[PDB]
């Protein structure tokens, strides 16, 4: 149920030690990369500190050397506390709005405000409801409820009886009357009145009575970013825009006033600012018009730390014509700090394939694992990690239990690795459309 095995469903954190920052070589999924994971650990421990600006760390490296893996490790090693936002750098080139402003919203999405305030709620099974609608109306009525411990009678206002016939509270429901507003969230049905429910399904869940007192205060903690407040204070009922993307060019005075009230909330002690992480995946797909704004959005007090990943070597910058390292201009490479990765040794390839095999729960003989490591030496991690999922299914064709050499050699036979595909293109020139010609036998 919505936990389908992806290409990164085996990473359960960054995996490094949190006491001496030592990258232990096999923990929580990330296996093999040492120096880059220690530098990511240092960056991660200065994110949770909070006493630094929005800085820029560039995870540069060759393809399939674990860059999205390190970013997802830092995403899993923070929990749902500090806001992590992914941004593949082609969501910026929109048509609903401009391009620099679409980047500004992605900066504002990663600066949370965390405020904690209390509510008063009521648990409990309804014993019975009597409503004095007799021609009368919703004027007076009695509500008898109980927990396992308590039991009580309440009288109701008119604007509560109009919420009781609104949710249709039966004799046996497990409701949560939020006292400060009046909404009723039925948590379920009580088991002891299972006879008293006729208009339900044959398969219907039933709960027990709530345990404890019947009138308690909850300290809920909410955390919303500054872009949330910006989109809220933009129309009449404008929060729908951030669920439908129909927000446009937000005027800058609104952002300035909200940057003032967040500081006034912090100085009164009513609030607390949490700087998040913004991960700009594939940062080489930005033109120089973006870098001339990231060079100055990383200057203010309210700026999240930017982590970004580049594949290209000496390549061209979009918008302009002159080449540069990593596809980035040099005045922006002065800002960033670069972490370089390395290709993988074959034993690390073998144990990464072992983790990817244990994640999908596929049994492997060690001979097939040796053959698969030999393939991954010559065709990369992605090809072998797909040959695993193919070979399990090919073993399931002929009703086998463990995969073997006779199935990896079929998966290697049907599905070409991209090197042999490049050889296929080079040896089938005259029929494949290069630029001009089509020859038909």
């Amino acid at each position: 149920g919505l936990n389908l095995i992806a290409a990164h469903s085996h990473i359960r954190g960054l995996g490094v030690d949190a006491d001496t920052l030592e990258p232990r070589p096999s923990s929580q999924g990330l296996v093999g990369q040492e120096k880059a994971r220690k530098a990511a650990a240092v960056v991660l421990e200065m994110i949770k500190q909070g006493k630094i600006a929005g800085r820029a760390v560039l995870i540069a490296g060759p393809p399939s050397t674990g860059k999205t893996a390190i970013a997802m490790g830092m995403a899993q090693s923070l929990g749902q506390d500090v806001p992590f936002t992914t941004l593949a750098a082609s969501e910026i080139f929109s048509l609903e709005m401009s391009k620099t402003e679409a980047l500004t919203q992605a900066f504002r999405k990663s600066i949370g405000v965390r405020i904690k305030e209390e509510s008063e709620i009521m648990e409990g099974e309804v014993v019975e409801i009597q409503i004095d609608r007799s021609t009368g109306g919703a004027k007076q009525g009695k509500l008898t409820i109980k927990t396992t411990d308590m039991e009580a009678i309440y009288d109701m206002g008119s604007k509560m009886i109009d919420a009781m016939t609104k949710e249709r509270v039966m004799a046996g429901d497990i409701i949560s009357i939020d006292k400060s507003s009046g909404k009723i969230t039925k948590l379920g049905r009580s088991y002891a009145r299972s006879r008293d429910y006729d208009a339900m399904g044959v398969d219907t869940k039933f709960l027990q009575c709530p345990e404890g007192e019947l009138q308690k205060r909850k300290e809920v903690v909410h955390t919303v970013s500054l872009h949330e407040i910006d989109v809220i204070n933009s129309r009449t009922q404008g929060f729908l825009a951030l669920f439908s993307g129909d927000t446009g060019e937000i005027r800058s005075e609104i952002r300035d006033q909200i940057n003032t009230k967040v500081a006034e909330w912090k100085e009164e002690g009513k609030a607390e600012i949490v700087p998040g992480v913004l991960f700009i995946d594939e940062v080489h797909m930005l033109d120089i018009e973006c870098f001339s704004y990231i060079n100055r959005a990383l200057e203010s007090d309210l700026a999240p730390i930017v982590i970004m990943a580049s594949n290209r070597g000496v390549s061209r910058i979009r918008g302009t014509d002159y080449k540069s390292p990593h596809g980035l201009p040099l005045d922006f490479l002065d800002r960033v700090v670069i972490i370089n990765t390395h290709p993988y040794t074959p034993d690390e390839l073998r144990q990464i394939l072992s983790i990817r095999a244990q994640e999908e729960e596929v049994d492997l003989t060690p001979d097939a694992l040796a053959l698969l490591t030999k393939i991954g030496q010559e065709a990369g991690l992605r090809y072998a990690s797909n040959l695993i999922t193919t070979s399990q299914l090919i073993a399931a064709k002929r009703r086998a239990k463990q995969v073997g050499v006779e199935d990896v050699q079929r998966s290697f036979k049907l599905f070409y690795d991209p090197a042999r595909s490049v050889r296929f293109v080079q040896e089938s020139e005259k029929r494949l459309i290069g630029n001009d010609g089509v020859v038909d036998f």
Binding site: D149, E151, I153, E213
Partner: protein, 65 residues
């Protein structure tokens, strides 16, 4: 003369009548304001003849005739 005593008409803050703490909810069996579940336990296992004396101390006992 002697009919100058005046009643009231205002919302009253109802307190507990077992203890003196502020109590927000009563009972169906004995109609006692009570603070929490310990006082509810001591209400539902008290010996008979006293659950009416609490309403006697608060007033409106309504003893039989």
């Amino acid at each position: 003369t002697n009919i100058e005593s005046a009643p009231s008409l205002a919302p009253m803050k109802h307190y507990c009548d077992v203890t003196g703490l502020p109590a927000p909810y009563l009972d169906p069996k004995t109609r006692l304001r009570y603070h929490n579940k310990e006082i509810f336990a001591m209400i539902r296992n008290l010996p008979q003849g006293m659950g009416e004396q609490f309403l006697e101390a608060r007033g409106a006992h309504t003893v039989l005739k």
